């Protein structure tokens, strides 16, 4: 439903048309010579254009590989958009399927990369995804499971605060360290106890919080938590 002429002209438009047509070899040929990171109209970049051309019916191996080959050629998956809007890598970490982030990881994007506006590890953006697939993909590629944001929060701590319960469970199962304290002295367990104290006994949320507690204990984490100092 989208037309490349609305965003690009000239050499960039010719590359945009090869992306539109899913022509991997033509993309490889043009990408070594075309300005890959100069934005077009409406904040569109050629890399976002490739993402836009690999969804729905067009989520094919070849069109996913177009993403990979653009990045290998110099397209920056961490380039921000204006006013604090996010990069293609951050954007696709929010997806419900890991095919797009994998295409980027296959081009050498670091699973420990930080974003260029805020300096926050991009893996934190997986916590807003509908399922854990993009987090799984980053962990499978070697991301530091205990990486922290600027306030000392880990993914485990942030995921519970986000109420991203399946992300919490996956992180515990993969061996995330549950005893890490953020800068404020809280562990994930401190918040888990608070959530359990506020939940309605027998509710679906109470069952899910107790599942997390059981899995925390199964993986050797301390329960009950030490009070915050």
């Amino acid at each position: 439903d989208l037309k490349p002429d609305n965003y690009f002209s000239g050499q960039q438009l010719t590359l945009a048309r090869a992306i539109e047509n899913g022509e991997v070899d033509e993309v490889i040929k043009l990408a070594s010579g075309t300005d890959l990171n100069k934005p077009g109209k409406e904040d569109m970049t050629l890399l976002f254009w490739a993402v836009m051309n690999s969804i729905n019916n067009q989520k094919t191996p070849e069109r996913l590989n177009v993403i990979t080959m653009l990045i290998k050629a110099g397209a920056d998956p961490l380039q921000p958009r204006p006013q604090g809007k996010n990069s293609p890598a951050e954007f696709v970490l929010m997806a419900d399927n890991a095919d797009w982030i994998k295409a980027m990881l296959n081009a050498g994007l670091s699973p420990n990369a930080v974003d260029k506006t805020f300096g926050k590890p991009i893996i934190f953006q997986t916590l807003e995804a509908k399922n854990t697939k993009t987090l799984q993909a980053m962990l499978d590629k070697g991301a530091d499971i205990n990486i922290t944001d600027s306030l000392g929060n880990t993914l485990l701590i942030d995921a519970l605060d986000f109420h991203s319960y399946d992300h919490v469970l996956l992180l515990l199962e993969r061996g995330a360290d549950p005893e890490i304290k953020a800068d404020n002295g809280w562990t994930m367990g401190n918040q888990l106890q608070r959530f359990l104290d506020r939940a309605k006994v027998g509710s679906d949320e109470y069952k899910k919080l107790n599942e997390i507690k059981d899995v925390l204990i199964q993986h050797g984490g301390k329960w009950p938590p030490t009070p915050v100092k």
């Binding site: 809007k85 954007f91 929010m94 995804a129 600027s150």
Partner: protein, 277 residues
């Protein structure tokens, strides 16, 4: 001529104390409500100001006198466990956006608290019916992206429950709905103005974080305003009805009428206190 906000704040304090020390019950009652509205109208002016943020990485113009926007000061935000990144959504234009303001101690002394203030969307949309000629909407749809401002608002609530420094929550309209979620989840005091209520699906989704409490939310509303005039739950908190609105339900919804109506009530209680001199 003019006068500094610090002088005006002190004078109002003195007037309130006159009412509270009065032997007349009506001056005493007026002094309590005047003290509440004095605080509330400051929160309401912040709730008006958040609509002026354009680039969230830049200063918001027109910040109310005696307040400072710290939304881009990471050193100041970390006192509350906040950073810049968590204050707005980043996939598209930020309809969901929070600003954090700190009061000037030279003006308010210790009478005012830091406040995080929420703005919601101007036109809520069920995601499948958005204009898919807009490429970002097309992309979010095709990538299976989750669309829920209440997730980021509840997350901020989970964080602010840990803050060692007091920080109040405030918001207008849909931002007042978000504010009430953050307030209930954190335990911090909240002020909302013509706020949206919390839908049952939202309350269920986030469990006990959105359960109970609400006693420390002051839910101000202009009598006759759109939302109360209307699966549409009531705004959470202790209702504070405001007469003196003008026009229809749409006009009365605006934050400017909320501010004006609070000022009308202050004038009214001031006149009562002055009548017992």
């Amino acid at each position: 001529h003019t006068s500094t906000k610090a002088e005006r704040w002190q004078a109002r304090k003195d007037l309130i104390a006159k009412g509270s020390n009065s032997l007349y019950p009506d001056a005493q009652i007026a002094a309590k409500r005047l003290a509440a509205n004095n605080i509330a109208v400051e929160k309401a002016k912040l709730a008006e100001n958040v609509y002026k943020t354009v680039n969230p990485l830049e200063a918001t113009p027109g910040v109310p006198e005696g307040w400072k926007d710290i939304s881009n000061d990471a050193g100041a935000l970390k006192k509350y466990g906040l950073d810049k990144e968590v204050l707005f959504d980043h996939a598209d234009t930020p309809d969901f956006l929070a600003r954090v303001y700190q009061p000037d101690s030279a003006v308010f002394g210790s009478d005012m608290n830091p406040t995080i203030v929420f703005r919601g969307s101007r036109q809520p949309e069920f995601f499948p019916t958005k204009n898919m000629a807009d490429w970002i909407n097309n992309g979010a749809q095709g990538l299976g992206m989750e669309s829920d401002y209440y997730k980021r608002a509840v997350r901020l609530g989970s964080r602010l429950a840990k803050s060692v420094s007091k920080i109040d929550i405030a918001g207008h309209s849909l931002g007042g709905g978000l504010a009430s979620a953050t307030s209930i989840a954190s335990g911090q005091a909240g002020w909302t103005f013509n706020a949206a209520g919390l839908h049952s699906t939202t309350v269920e989704k986030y469990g006990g974080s959105l359960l109970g409490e609400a006693d420390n939310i002051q839910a101000y509303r202009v009598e006759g305003e759109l939302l109360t005039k209307i699966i549409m739950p009531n705004a959470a908190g202790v209702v504070h009805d405001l007469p003196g609105g003008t026009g229809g339900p749409l006009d009365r919804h605006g934050i400017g009428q909320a501010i004006d109506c609070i000022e009308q009530q202050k004038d009214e209680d001031i006149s009562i206190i002055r009548s017992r001199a």
